[PDB]
Protein backbone atom coordinates (compact mmCIF):
# COMPACT_ATOMS: atom_id res chain seq x y z
CA UNK A 1 0.00 0.00 0.00
CA UNK A 2 0.94 3.71 -0.44
CA UNK A 3 0.74 6.50 2.18
CA UNK A 4 -1.78 9.26 3.10
CA UNK A 5 -0.64 12.64 1.74
CA UNK A 6 -2.41 14.74 4.43
CA UNK A 7 -0.78 12.61 7.21
CA UNK A 8 2.71 12.81 5.63
CA UNK A 9 2.52 16.60 4.79
CA UNK A 10 1.49 17.32 8.47
CA UNK A 11 4.88 15.67 9.45
CA UNK A 12 7.12 17.58 6.95
CA UNK A 13 5.34 20.99 6.64
CA UNK A 14 3.53 21.45 9.99
CA UNK A 15 2.04 24.98 10.16
CA UNK A 16 4.96 26.59 8.23
CA UNK A 17 3.79 28.79 5.27
CA UNK A 18 5.88 29.22 2.03
CA UNK A 19 6.59 31.42 -1.07
CA UNK A 20 4.63 30.14 -4.14
CA UNK A 21 6.78 32.33 -6.42
CA UNK A 22 10.12 30.52 -6.76
CA UNK A 23 11.80 27.40 -5.38
CA UNK A 24 14.31 25.04 -6.98
CA UNK A 25 15.85 21.84 -5.57
CA UNK A 26 18.80 22.05 -8.00
CA UNK A 27 20.08 24.90 -5.77
CA UNK A 28 19.52 23.00 -2.52
CA UNK A 29 21.39 19.68 -3.18
CA UNK A 30 18.14 17.98 -4.27
CA UNK A 31 18.67 17.23 -7.99
CA UNK A 32 21.07 14.47 -9.36
CA UNK A 33 22.62 14.75 -12.94
CA UNK A 34 20.43 14.57 -16.05
CA UNK A 35 20.52 11.12 -17.75
CA UNK A 36 19.54 9.86 -21.26
CA UNK A 37 17.19 7.13 -22.64
CA UNK A 38 18.24 6.39 -26.18
CA UNK A 39 15.81 4.47 -28.51
CA UNK A 40 13.99 3.19 -25.40
CA UNK A 41 10.58 3.86 -23.66
CA UNK A 42 12.05 3.52 -20.13
CA UNK A 43 11.14 7.12 -18.92
CA UNK A 44 9.16 5.44 -16.09
CA UNK A 45 12.42 3.99 -14.67
CA UNK A 46 14.41 7.26 -15.09
CA UNK A 47 11.62 9.40 -13.48
CA UNK A 48 11.15 7.03 -10.46
CA UNK A 49 14.91 6.27 -9.91
CA UNK A 50 15.76 9.99 -10.07
CA UNK A 51 13.19 10.68 -7.32
CA UNK A 52 14.86 8.11 -5.08
CA UNK A 53 18.34 9.59 -5.90
CA UNK A 54 16.89 13.00 -4.85
CA UNK A 55 15.59 11.68 -1.52
CA UNK A 56 19.07 10.28 -0.66
CA UNK A 57 20.64 13.64 -1.50
CA UNK A 58 17.95 15.56 0.50
CA UNK A 59 17.38 13.26 3.49
CA UNK A 60 20.79 11.61 3.78
CA UNK A 61 23.20 14.07 1.90
CA UNK A 62 24.27 10.92 -0.02
CA UNK A 63 24.76 11.40 -3.74
CA UNK A 64 23.97 8.09 -5.21
CA UNK A 65 23.19 7.39 -8.87
CA UNK A 66 21.06 4.22 -9.14
CA UNK A 67 20.52 1.68 -11.97
CA UNK A 68 17.57 2.34 -14.31
CA UNK A 69 18.73 -0.82 -16.16
CA UNK A 70 18.05 -2.96 -13.06
CA UNK A 71 14.50 -1.49 -13.00
CA UNK A 72 14.09 -2.04 -16.81
CA UNK A 73 15.33 -5.70 -16.46
CA UNK A 74 13.94 -6.72 -13.07
CA UNK A 75 10.68 -4.64 -12.64
CA UNK A 76 8.15 -7.35 -13.46
CA UNK A 77 4.95 -5.12 -13.17
CA UNK A 78 6.35 -2.91 -15.96
CA UNK A 79 7.47 -3.47 -19.57
CA UNK A 80 11.08 -2.31 -20.08
CA UNK A 81 11.57 -0.10 -23.25
CA UNK A 82 7.84 -0.77 -24.03
CA UNK A 83 6.54 1.44 -21.19
CA UNK A 84 5.56 1.33 -17.56
CA UNK A 85 3.97 3.04 -14.56
CA UNK A 86 5.79 5.17 -11.89
CA UNK A 87 3.80 3.52 -8.96
CA UNK A 88 4.56 -0.08 -10.24
CA UNK A 89 8.23 0.90 -10.42
CA UNK A 90 8.16 1.95 -6.75
CA UNK A 91 6.27 -1.28 -5.81
CA UNK A 92 8.95 -3.37 -7.53
CA UNK A 93 11.81 -1.39 -5.76
CA UNK A 94 10.34 -2.42 -2.42
CA UNK A 95 9.85 -6.08 -3.68
CA UNK A 96 13.44 -6.25 -5.11
CA UNK A 97 14.79 -4.88 -1.81
CA UNK A 98 16.28 -1.83 -3.48
CA UNK A 99 18.49 -1.16 -6.54
CA UNK A 100 22.26 -1.43 -7.35
CA UNK A 101 24.15 1.87 -8.08
CA UNK A 102 24.45 2.41 -11.87
CA UNK A 103 28.25 2.11 -11.38
CA UNK A 104 27.65 -1.67 -10.73
CA UNK A 105 24.69 -1.98 -13.17
CA UNK A 106 25.09 0.48 -16.12
CA UNK A 107 22.39 1.50 -18.60
CA UNK A 108 22.59 -0.29 -21.98
CA UNK A 109 19.12 1.05 -23.23
CA UNK A 110 17.30 -1.11 -25.91
CA UNK A 111 20.31 -3.52 -25.97
CA UNK A 112 19.11 -6.94 -24.75
CA UNK A 113 20.04 -7.50 -21.09
CA UNK A 114 19.16 -10.05 -18.34
CA UNK A 115 18.06 -9.29 -14.81
CA UNK A 116 20.62 -10.02 -12.07
CA UNK A 117 19.74 -8.68 -8.62
CA UNK A 118 23.26 -9.73 -7.42
CA UNK A 119 25.42 -7.25 -9.40
CA UNK A 120 26.33 -5.42 -6.16
CA UNK A 121 26.96 -6.01 -2.46
CA UNK A 122 24.91 -2.98 -1.26
CA UNK A 123 21.50 -2.00 -2.70
CA UNK A 124 19.63 1.30 -2.14
CA UNK A 125 15.95 0.91 -1.24
CA UNK A 126 12.78 2.79 -0.28
CA UNK A 127 10.37 2.41 2.65
CA UNK A 128 7.22 3.40 0.64
CA UNK A 129 5.89 6.01 -1.83
CA UNK A 130 3.12 8.64 -1.69
CA UNK A 131 0.54 9.84 -4.29
CA UNK A 132 0.51 13.64 -4.60
CA UNK A 133 -2.90 15.29 -5.25
CA UNK A 134 -2.91 17.42 -8.46
CA UNK A 135 -3.73 20.56 -6.35
CA UNK A 136 -0.76 20.16 -3.94
CA UNK A 137 2.20 19.99 -6.35
CA UNK A 138 3.84 23.29 -5.15
CA UNK A 139 3.42 22.35 -1.42
CA UNK A 140 4.73 18.76 -2.05
CA UNK A 141 7.77 20.08 -3.96
CA UNK A 142 8.68 22.67 -1.28
CA UNK A 143 8.33 20.38 1.81
CA UNK A 144 8.72 16.79 0.49
CA UNK A 145 11.01 17.17 -2.56
CA UNK A 146 11.10 16.24 -6.29
CA UNK A 147 8.09 14.29 -7.66
CA UNK A 148 7.88 11.54 -10.39
CA UNK A 149 5.15 12.89 -12.73
CA UNK A 150 3.47 11.79 -16.01
CA UNK A 151 3.14 14.21 -18.91
CA UNK A 152 1.58 14.41 -22.39
CA UNK A 153 4.40 15.20 -24.83
CA UNK A 154 3.92 16.59 -28.37
CA UNK A 155 6.56 16.77 -31.17
CA UNK A 156 6.96 20.50 -30.27
CA UNK A 157 8.14 19.39 -26.85
CA UNK A 158 11.08 17.52 -28.51
CA UNK A 159 12.01 20.84 -30.26
CA UNK A 160 12.11 22.80 -26.96
CA UNK A 161 15.37 24.78 -26.51
CA UNK A 162 14.89 27.40 -23.72
CA UNK A 163 12.36 29.51 -21.78
CA UNK A 164 8.80 28.42 -20.97
CA UNK A 165 6.79 26.01 -23.15
CA UNK A 166 3.01 26.25 -23.71
CA UNK A 167 0.18 25.13 -25.99
CA UNK A 168 1.78 22.08 -27.59
CA UNK A 169 0.41 19.04 -25.69
CA UNK A 170 0.24 15.34 -26.50
CA UNK A 171 -3.04 13.42 -26.99
CA UNK A 172 -2.41 11.18 -23.89
CA UNK A 173 -0.02 10.79 -20.91
CA UNK A 174 2.95 9.21 -22.57
CA UNK A 175 6.06 10.38 -20.62
CA UNK A 176 7.55 10.14 -17.10
CA UNK A 177 9.61 13.16 -15.80
CA UNK A 178 10.62 14.74 -12.47
CA UNK A 179 9.18 17.89 -11.09
CA UNK A 180 12.19 19.60 -9.39
CA UNK A 181 10.72 23.02 -8.59
CA UNK A 182 8.90 26.22 -9.64
CA UNK A 183 9.86 29.80 -10.54
CA UNK A 184 8.77 33.24 -11.76
CA UNK A 185 10.03 35.73 -14.31
CA UNK A 186 8.70 39.29 -14.61
CA UNK A 187 8.58 40.29 -18.32
CA UNK A 188 7.42 43.72 -19.68
CA UNK A 189 5.01 43.12 -22.62
CA UNK A 190 6.45 44.68 -25.89
CA UNK A 191 2.87 45.78 -26.86
CA UNK A 192 1.19 46.99 -23.60
CA UNK A 193 4.69 48.12 -22.34
CA UNK A 194 3.61 46.75 -18.88
CA UNK A 195 5.29 44.23 -16.54
CA UNK A 196 3.77 40.73 -16.15
CA UNK A 197 4.54 37.89 -13.69
CA UNK A 198 5.19 34.60 -15.56
CA UNK A 199 5.18 31.49 -13.30
CA UNK A 200 6.59 28.10 -14.33
CA UNK A 201 7.35 24.58 -13.13
CA UNK A 202 10.90 23.30 -13.43
CA UNK A 203 11.06 19.78 -14.90
CA UNK A 204 13.98 17.29 -15.15
CA UNK A 205 13.80 15.28 -18.41
CA UNK A 206 15.85 12.11 -19.18
CA UNK A 207 16.77 13.09 -22.78
CA UNK A 208 20.36 14.04 -22.02
CA UNK A 209 21.97 17.36 -21.15
CA UNK A 210 21.97 18.48 -24.82
CA UNK A 211 18.14 18.74 -24.68
CA UNK A 212 16.40 21.96 -23.69
CA UNK A 213 17.99 23.92 -20.84
CA UNK A 214 20.81 21.56 -19.61
CA UNK A 215 18.30 18.61 -19.83
CA UNK A 216 15.50 20.63 -18.13
CA UNK A 217 12.26 22.32 -19.26
CA UNK A 218 10.22 25.17 -17.73
CA UNK A 219 6.41 24.77 -18.13
CA UNK A 220 3.82 27.56 -17.69
CA UNK A 221 1.86 27.46 -14.42
CA UNK A 222 0.09 30.08 -12.22
CA UNK A 223 0.99 31.46 -8.70
CA UNK A 224 -1.12 28.69 -7.01
CA UNK A 225 0.47 25.92 -9.10
CA UNK A 226 -2.96 24.52 -9.95
CA UNK A 227 -2.25 25.13 -13.69
CA UNK A 228 -0.90 21.79 -14.99
CA UNK A 229 -0.10 22.11 -18.73
CA UNK A 230 -0.07 18.83 -20.80
CA UNK A 231 -1.62 16.95 -17.85
CA UNK A 232 1.64 17.29 -15.91
CA UNK A 233 1.34 15.61 -12.55
CA UNK A 234 -1.86 13.62 -13.37
CA UNK A 235 0.25 10.78 -11.93
CA UNK A 236 2.41 12.23 -9.14
CA UNK A 237 4.42 9.96 -6.81
CA UNK A 238 7.20 10.78 -4.31
CA UNK A 239 9.29 7.95 -2.67
CA UNK A 240 10.14 7.97 1.04
CA UNK A 241 13.37 6.44 2.28
O1 LIG B 1 12.03 7.48 -26.60
C1 LIG B 1 11.51 8.29 -27.34
C2 LIG B 1 12.33 9.22 -28.14
C3 LIG B 1 12.57 10.44 -27.68
C4 LIG B 1 13.43 11.36 -28.44
C5 LIG B 1 14.82 11.13 -28.42
C6 LIG B 1 15.70 11.97 -29.12
C7 LIG B 1 15.11 13.02 -29.84
C8 LIG B 1 13.75 13.25 -29.84
C9 LIG B 1 12.86 12.43 -29.14
O2 LIG B 1 13.51 14.36 -30.62
C10 LIG B 1 14.76 14.83 -31.17
O3 LIG B 1 15.75 13.95 -30.61
C11 LIG B 1 10.02 8.32 -27.43
C12 LIG B 1 9.24 9.11 -26.57
C13 LIG B 1 7.86 9.09 -26.72
C14 LIG B 1 7.27 8.25 -27.69
C15 LIG B 1 8.05 7.43 -28.53
N1 LIG B 1 7.47 6.58 -29.51
O4 LIG B 1 7.76 6.70 -30.69
O5 LIG B 1 6.57 5.56 -29.13
C16 LIG B 1 9.44 7.48 -28.38
Author numbering: -17 to 223
In the authors' words:
As well as having haemoglobinase activity, FP2 is involved in degrading the erythrocyte skeletal protein ankyrin in a process necessary for red blood cell rupture at the end of the parasite intra-erythrocytic cycle. The substrate cleft and the catalytic site are located between these sub-domains.
Crystals of recombinant mature FP2, lacking the inhibitory pro-domain and with the catalytic site cysteine substituted by alanine for increased stability, were soaked with two previously identified (E)-chalcone molecules, EC54, which exhibited the most potent purely competitive inhibition among derivatives in this earlier study, and EC48. The FP2-EC48 structure, resolved by molecular replacement, revealed two FP2 copies per asymmetric unit of the crystal. Both protein copies exhibited bound EC48 inhibitor (see below) and had nearly identical tertiary structure, with root-mean-square-deviation (RMSD) of Ca atoms below 0.1 Å. EC48 locates in a position distinct from the FP2 catalytic site. In addition, the structure provides a mechanism for the observed mixed inhibition of FP2 by EC48, as the molecule occupies part of the substrate binding cleft, thereby competing with substrates, and locates just 5.1 and 7.5 Å away from the FP2 H417 and C285, respectively, which comprise the catalytic dyad. In contrast, EC48 occupies the middle of the substrate cleft via its nitrobenzene group and binds to the rear of the cleft via its benzodioxol group. The structure shows that EC48 binds only to the rear of the FP2 substrate cleft, thereby mimicking interactions formed by the L2 loop of naturally occurring, protein-based inhibitors of FP2.
